[PDB]
Design a protein around this ligand. Structure first.
Ligand SMILES: Nc1ncnc2c1ncn2[C@@H]1O[C@H](COP(=O)(O)OP(=O)(O)OP(O)(O)=S)[C@@H](O)[C@H]1O
Ligand SMILES: Nc1ncnc2c1ncn2[C@@H]1O[C@H](COP(=O)(O)OP(=O)(O)OP(O)(O)=S)[C@@H](O)[C@H]1O
Ligand SMILES: Nc1ncnc2c1ncn2[C@@H]1O[C@H](COP(=O)(O)OP(=O)(O)OP(O)(O)=S)[C@@H](O)[C@H]1O
Ligand SMILES: [Mg+2]
Ligand SMILES: [Mg+2]
Ligand SMILES: [Mg+2]
Lengths: 327, 327, 327, 327, 327
């Protein structure tokens, strides 16, 4: 039948599953045809979350088109109310319109799906405190923790969303499913998706020119800050510096005379330095602004040239801000 | 002659036309007539995007100035929706919520019936990457390669907006048309320019001399952004200043000594200078505040003098911004 | 009389009505009444024009104070709607919001209405492209050759303002009215101001004592920067600069050896000091805060001493602003 | 008694009523009882005045605490307007939105009330020439002569004020009312000082410590800043300064070098110096780059020593800010 | 004891209340439970005082536990307010804006809530005269002190802060209950986080992640501000200084080359240093920052290395700041 069925991501037993990164043409129908069926089978109530209030008028549609699947049950949709057997089965909620839903009747639900969670192509429009609210949302509208499902379908090709900014996820393009103790990021039908888009440019060559626009192909490309060098030695080393309560050693090597800055503490503890007296101690000395720079003339020249290398991007940023303060 | 004349625009028949000029001077007249002409031919309904929502509460009189074009049949508005003899005419919405629209069926489109797509000196209105927003709009008004023909229409001619140089849309003041695969750059006849500007000279003499200023001249002729003297020559590559991710270099031609800022490459592997740490890696060298004025002594002096010359407008803008950064 | 009516001013029929200062002369309510009379007797629509959107309370602040003076006619206030004798002809017009203007069809308004024209010590966030904005509005409404008038009044006598400077008008207290090829200027009388000053002094001693204060003088006579010395002379020419639009040319007189500043410029290949590259070209020269001071120490020491006299008021203004920039 | 009593305050009944002292002792409530007594029995309309937008929005609550005073009448705030007995009784107008509001309706005005006309522990957050905006208000309200009042209320005696310094008044700390033909300066009674202070002490003992805190005394008896040394002597002077439109003389003592800054400005061709660029005369000299340090060495050292002595509070402060601007 | 009991704090029932050094798990839990229950049983209004504007969105997320203690009370978040059972409970405002909202009088406030009056291990930028502004608020809202309290919670144990120095407090952190006439200082037992956090985590892991908010971890950790030894020496002093109204006298012990910073300083003819004009008087001597080193080279050197000593861990604050004034 259909290539993709959410049965795998449901049976994974993971509390949090994220079907994010595809069109949703088959996906949304796939996991919208099941919940009404679970209601009819085991009285299992269901909630869909639209991104915001005006989307309530866009959710009444599907009950009509699912007619072929649901012949023998009376189908009614009344704003938020979902009526099957002339009875309440599901509820659709906006994120900002939440107050009236706090006292609303949600006896037992194990599904909350976010669709179009990001306002697509607004000026990064933010819904106030999405996840700071969502924590109490999950613990409140749902009954318990045993068998609770918090899912997010996506249509936008999002390298990250503010929800991810909170949870701080680290997925990969390779792993179709990204499973953890709690969470699971799923990238749907990646090849077919791409193929499913290919064919539409055959239906319209001007859409071929539109695809040729680097904007369409650059949302498949992520951008961020990147590391510089990941280096270490196996030989002698001399200096030591500390800043903002964090210590950075200095490594040297005679072979090519190279110079690295890697984590190294010397209980011998000579010439330990800071830029600012917020890290004062009887051992360290408040460095003169630039004379100590000339003392570390080799370090200065290594910064000017390529002779300075490091083993982290975090060490990169700390060292770089120190360099900016150095002059 | 007399008015705005879309005959050549319709004639050369790009699937996507691109015209500019005539601020309020019928740049919207003929193009609001044309959808009703398609309706008298009994074609398809049109789509009207708006920049924002308040702009909608007053604009229900969209057919007032086309009655004197076509007094014959019924051209009215029931409210938000436009009706010609009672049949649906225009799908009329601002930008904010097109995503909620994009799952609806849109089988009938005729033409693009919006103007002031981009306003001069107006980016607070703008939405980030709205060029791809128009891409989503077009693909959600596409069913095949037919039924659609598009126009852009800015009040004046500029060469700095992302769309142009993204498509290398280059205006020509000697010739009316500039032709590409699908993109045209045009303006009404220079003879029609003479006729209509002379018509404005007639009557309100103050409204004529206000056109005598370049203030009202540039709105319709579009002579803008060509500010610095600019040339090019065959000198040798000497220096290159990697700034914010650019391979900018300097040609120095001693015969008739001037510095030309054209872009090129040689395997110099030296003399490449960076003014930021983000553009620095382990094969180029960093330069602090003053040392640019000394190592690029030729650059500094030729900038202070009139001896510095330029090649391209984008290079001119980024170089002046750099000249602001260098202190 | 009590409240002068501007028909004698309107007699000349130039579109621009530059009335300045006149705190409390009743130009406000005269320009309220006049379009009402025009609509009543002929049928011409009217629009109350301000600069910004946020003011909505001016539904009642404009129309109540002038509602009663009409003896035997009907008026209706419907928010942004104004009705005279059951005829809808009046609405509020914001300038900061230009976009709604470019959608709205123009009501046939004989004269645009505007007082509080000048900004006195505002936050300086006025409308950019201000004179261009007024030109765009004038072109937008009545694109035909039918003539349209405008009335604009300033709270206090600011001798130079962006539009006044822009169209190179010049003020003259001695002659109340002023006429050019396409311009009309006007100044308030002194008899009415004297009468009102006696009214305040005899009425209450608070404003009787406040009359001797500077601010009340400014409310009638409009104290400006004219007080500083302002003369020119026919001495020999010495030096020349260009500053963001004005080509200052400075003369020197050995007799008493002072220095004079005039807008007259000597066409000469001598070095011209440009403070900003926005005036850079082949022959001008860019200079920074040190060497301009070192080579124009003549000018600077002459300025701190009593050794400068300016030809024109705008010359004084631009010279002082430039000196502030240099400081 | 404990309540704030305005009987002797109205005993003179002048329009400029600077009411000082008794921080937060219900003087503002005693005000609030007044415009009710005026409007209800007479129909006159009142004006509420405060600097900034938060105090514009929540003025209803400041009227809500009035909903207990007059039971029979109806007191409702619609929008940001006060309705007493179902009729419009007053308006609350902020200052910063001032110019546009100059054209507000004043069919009749009773009292323009402004708490905290002195700034409270802030950083120069005075609307520049706030006095100009206030006096423009009184000018605009002055169309209906009879019974106009402009009440301004504060909480501490302070010659550190644009107001008192601007009107060149000499306040007193013991004369219960410093009166002129137009204005009043009120220091509250003595018995109620003790009454409220014992009230604070009895209610709580850290309130007694506040009674030991000099801040409470300043908010009760006022800071005249008389503490800084002050004297004068017949001895002559060397230099002469003008700052912020005020002359200034530097008396020099024959013996002991006790420098005086008394206002002894003899009209002389002697050298006179300023620092603010607004001060320029044909007779006097400007000073820059710390030349004044090399001219008045003895004054600089004398202030850096205990030698200097200031004749007047206005003189003393003005010298302070001049020193602040010097560096 | 597993649960902190705010009964312990209100058993001593002092008006001035400082709950400091809490871990903010059980202390925050109980403190959150306290006030709404107190109002519900009796009735009270509360103010949620905070630092700045960016934290205005944090207040809307506060009832994650209290509603759990109220299975039958519905607390609805209305923007920046809370409604208990549909009734406006109190209000939440950033502290600094209160100065603008200074003069507003509120009916009868019982508990004045504040959190983290001391902000530890950060920038900790504090507006000048914060304590004076807080006392201004206290004076503003109070006439009758019948059972009114000002409660503040901070998660730090430290005697160096604006408030303790302001009130001349000397609480010893080793103990757990120091008292003043109307103030109380306590340190809650650290073992209070357990039964609040790892019980609800030991239940289920997804519950432990439900705890979260990612901010409890900052408060739980504790740090000691002591850097070097604090001692007093029996060798006599040489120089003395006065800073921001806080005196100081530097002592020297030639043996072992030490210097001490005991505040106890002997007045004599030797006039002290000063750094700002306000602090200056008719007897003391003031110096510029550069000549400060040329007076106390030994102070300079003791700031370079670790020669200088201290007498109290709070003194190190004044020393650090005055060092920064040296620049
Ligand atoms: N075929 C035409 N017949 C008559 N007038 C025309 C014709 N074409 C253009 N015009 C002129 O165009 C004016 C109205 O054109 P508009 O629709 O305003 O064009 P526009 O440039 O879009 O200006 P805006 O900003 O859209 S209102 C009329 O008042 C005429 O002066
Ligand atoms: N038709 C009228 N009926 C009655 N009073 C009028 C009329 N026209 C003007 N006035 C008077 O004009 C006086 C001045 O009010 P405004 O009309 O606001 O003056 P204004 O000239 O706009 O002041 P400026 O120049 O804008 S600062 C008022 O006191 C009115 O009584
Ligand atoms: N008749 C009254 N008797 C006693 N206290 C009163 C009375 N009327 C008001 N108050 C109280 O006075 C206090 C301060 O209110 P305000 O009227 O604003 O004081 P104020 O004198 O105006 O000083 P500010 O700076 O305006 S708050 C409040 O606590 C009121 O409850
Ligand atoms: Mg148009
Ligand atoms: Mg006016
Ligand atoms: Mg008050």
């Amino acid at each position: 039948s259909l290539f993709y069925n959410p049965q795998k991501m449901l049976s994974y037993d993971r509390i949090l599953n994220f079907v994010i990164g595809a069109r949703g043409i088959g996906k949304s129908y796939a996991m919208k045809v099941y919940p009404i069926n679970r209601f009819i089978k085991y009285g299992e109530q269901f909630i869909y979350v639209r991104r915001y209030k005006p989307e309530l008028a866009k959710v009444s549609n599907y009950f009509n088109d699912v007619a072929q699947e649901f012949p023998d049950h009376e189908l009614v949709v009344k704003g938020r109310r979902f009526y099957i057997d002339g009875k309440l089965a599901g509820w659709a909620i906006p994120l900002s319109v939440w107050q009236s839903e706090k006292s609303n009747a949600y006896p037992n639900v194990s599904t909350i799906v976010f669709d179009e969670f990001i306002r697509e192509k607004d000026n990064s429009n933010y819904i106030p405190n999405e996840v700071s609210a969502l924590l109490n949302l999950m613990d409140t509208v749902f009954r318990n923790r045993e068998r609770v499902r918090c899912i997010c379908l996506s249509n936008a090709v999002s390298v990250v969303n503010p929800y991810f900014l909170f949870f701080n996820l680290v997925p990969d393009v390779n792993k179709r499913f990204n499973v953890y103790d709690d969470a699971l990021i799923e990238i749907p039908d990646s090849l077919d998706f791409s193929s499913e888009r290919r064919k539409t440019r055959f239906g319209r060559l001007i859409d071929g020119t539109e695809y040729g626009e680097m904007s369409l192909d650059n949302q498949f490309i992520g951008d961020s800050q990147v590391f510089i060098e990941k280096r270490s030695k196996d030989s002698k080393f001399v200096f030591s510096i500390v800043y903002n309560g964090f210590t950075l050693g200095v490594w040297v090597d005679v072979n090519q005379g190279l110079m690295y800055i890697d984590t190294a503490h010397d209980p011998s503890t000579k010439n330990v330095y800071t830029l600012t007296t917020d890290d004062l101690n009887e051992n360290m000395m408040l460095i003169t602004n630039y004379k100590n720079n000339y003392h570390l003339r080799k370090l200065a020249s290594a910064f000017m040239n390529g002779y300075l290398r490091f083993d982290n991007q975090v060490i990169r940023n700390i060292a770089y801000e120190l360099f900016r303060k150095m002059r």
